Design a protein around this ligand. Structure first.
Ligand code: ADP
Ligand code: ADP
Lengths: 438, 153
């Protein structure tokens, strides 16, 4: 019912110019190994990419990274149409500007540091209005294509002139920053994400379904695991990734308000999540609010839990809002929070495995220049019981250590850090060694 | 100059062979009886320094590199995306020099310092106590780069 309509799935290839289909689909569509394609999605939007084959992709689905997925205004699960675009040709001019909130903090020649490397002999196809990301100098810069000579699409070839007229455009509301949490910023968890994903899929993406249906979707999702496991990161991603409205509640934070002023906040919070539903309410250190078991004691401490219980049971309505909480383990939480209609779903986010760390390591080093001697697999292999928060700290320390030896001693700090400088600096295996040895 | 169980600070107001010279057995030394007032940007030597700490070495080496960049090269973090250590916890029995250590790193790094003491905070009336914690943190930020040292945590 249109051989060219596919379900936007996740990417295997992190490159902004490629999208993957399955060979049988490439046949049915008569597409080849490197063909440039025209992709149509929502809000009457389009994108141009290179299509490769992917034996793990299904005939119906299409793999595409978050950059393209945004250029198209679609979320995972959504459907787009694909059409060949052989008529595309070498670009003449190209005007692009950086998105202001992605270059604050730096000064220098971005073109040299970012554009030049990014395009260089890659022949990336671009459509006007495209927004693309480029990583370097320990950060990522967002660029919008303001206009292309062969309009509205063309390939950026070694001859294509690239204008970058010095004024950073301001981001437009409906243009989510790529610097946002995504499923692509989570590693290790997979089965857990698979579960959570399907749990919120319908209620958060197809609300009307529940207006017309009589079945009950899961209402509360509880996340188990030690600190720095990515529970918050996971919840924030599912929200972003699903266009859902997000509202974070933090125990310590709530539990520091004066008696009564504390509950007024819980309610004001829930009350707001509903205003913007579909929404996800994430209670951070939950056990900081609901421990009741044997450890609860206080004509306020108890008055709060009860308040949370009430607020929980208060859910159930139109566009649904789901509640996600986090704690280290069952035992911590008030048994009352389990009572079905409340936190009736549970997900245990263990500690990554060897592969999981390798994955996590990659995610946290994507914006930095790693020397060829850097062996992340080794690093992954020796960090047995680490959790994401650990690995991230490990990367952060290896980079700061690198910054202290190199840049630091030459001394070009405390001023207005130059991109070219930060861009040249490379973290070495020696730098990770230093970090792993503290 | 140290002596009489204390140290005296002296400023050279003028030298004959100006602006520099050697003080030899013949050099006359005037000391006209009026003590000048210290100038803001002239830190007293009677201040805590790494040179007033002994025993710790490896610990100071660590703490030093930990605060080096964030406290001496702030812009780095305005231009960078990495996270510097945020809280440094000091373990050890009483009278180990934890406070002295923290106060030195601050002075020694031109950092702004703000001391918070548990007993002190915990003696304010309910609510009046938290208002102080916030007012404290709030002030350390006004003068950042700064170091907030919570004493008896
Ligand atoms: N699975 C993961 N993938 C990538 N980074 C992770 C992961 N788990 C943790 N982290 C890192 O650790 C920090 C962990 O904190 P957070 O997400 O708040 O986790 P938790 O809620 O368990 O403390 C995250 O911001 C992220 O940088
Ligand atoms: N390593 C040290 N070197 C020099 N003096 C020290 C040292 N440790 C402690 N002291 C002395 O002991 C007093 C110790 O108190 P303080 O610095 O407040 O330590 P702590 O916070 O552990 O009680 C200091 O003011 C200093 O005179």
């Amino acid at each position: 019912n249109r051989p060219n309509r596919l379900i936007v799935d996740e990417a295997i290839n992190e490159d902004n110019s490629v999208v993957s289909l399955s060979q049988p689909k490439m046949d049915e569509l008569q597409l080849f190994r490197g063909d440039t394609v025209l992709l149509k999605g929502k809000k009457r939007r389009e994108a141009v990419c290179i299509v490769l084959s992917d034996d793990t992709c299904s005939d119906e689905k299409i793999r595409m990274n978050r950059v393209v997925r945004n250029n198209l205004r679609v979320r995972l699960g959504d459907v787009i149409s694909i059409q060949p675009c052989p008529d595309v040709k070498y670009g003449k001019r190209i005007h692009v500007l950086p998105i202001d909130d992605t270059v604050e903090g730096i000064t220098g020649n971005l073109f040299e540091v970012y554009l030049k490397p990014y395009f260089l002999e890659a022949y990336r196809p671009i459509r006007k209005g495209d927004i693309f990301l480029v990583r370097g100098g320990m950060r990522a810069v967002e660029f919008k294509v303001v206009e292309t000579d062969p309009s509205p699409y063309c390939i950026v070839a070694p001859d294509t002139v690239i204008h970058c007229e010095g004024e950073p455009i301001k981001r437009e509301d409906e243009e989510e920053s790529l610097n946002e949490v995504g499923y692509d910023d989570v590693g290790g968890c997979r089965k857990q994400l698979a579960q959570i994903k399907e749990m919120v899929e319908l209620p958060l993406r197809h609300p009307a379904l529940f207006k017309a249906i009589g079945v009950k979707p899961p209402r509360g999702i509880l996340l188990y695991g030690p600190p720095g496991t990515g529970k918050t990161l996971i919840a924030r991603a599912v929200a972003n990734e699903t266009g859902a409205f997000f509202f974070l509640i933090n125990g310590p934070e709530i539990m520091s308000k004066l008696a009564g002023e504390s509950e007024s906040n819980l309610r004001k919070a829930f009350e707001e999540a509903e205003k913007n539903a579909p929404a996800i309410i994430f209670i951070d250190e939950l056990d900081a609010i609901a421990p009741k078991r044997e450890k609860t004691h206080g004509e306020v401490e108890r008055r709060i839990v009860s308040q949370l219980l009430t607020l929980m049971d208060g859910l159930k309505q139109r566009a649904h809002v789901i509640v996600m909480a986090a704690t280290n383990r069952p035992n911590s939480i008030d048994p009352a929070l389990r009572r079905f209609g409340r936190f009736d779903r549970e997900v245990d986010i263990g500690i990554p495995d060897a592969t999981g760390r390798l994955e996590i390591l990659q995610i946290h080093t994507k914006n930095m220049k790693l020397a060829d001697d850097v062996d992340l697999e080794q690093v992954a292999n020796e960090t047995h019981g680490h959790v994401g928060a650990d690995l991230a700290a490990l990367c952060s320390e290896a980079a700061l250590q690198a910054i202290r030896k190199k840049m630091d001693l030459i001394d070009l700090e405390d001023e207005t850090i130059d991109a070219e400088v930060m861009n040249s600096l490379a973290v070495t295996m020696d730098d990770f060694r230093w970090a792993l040895s503290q």
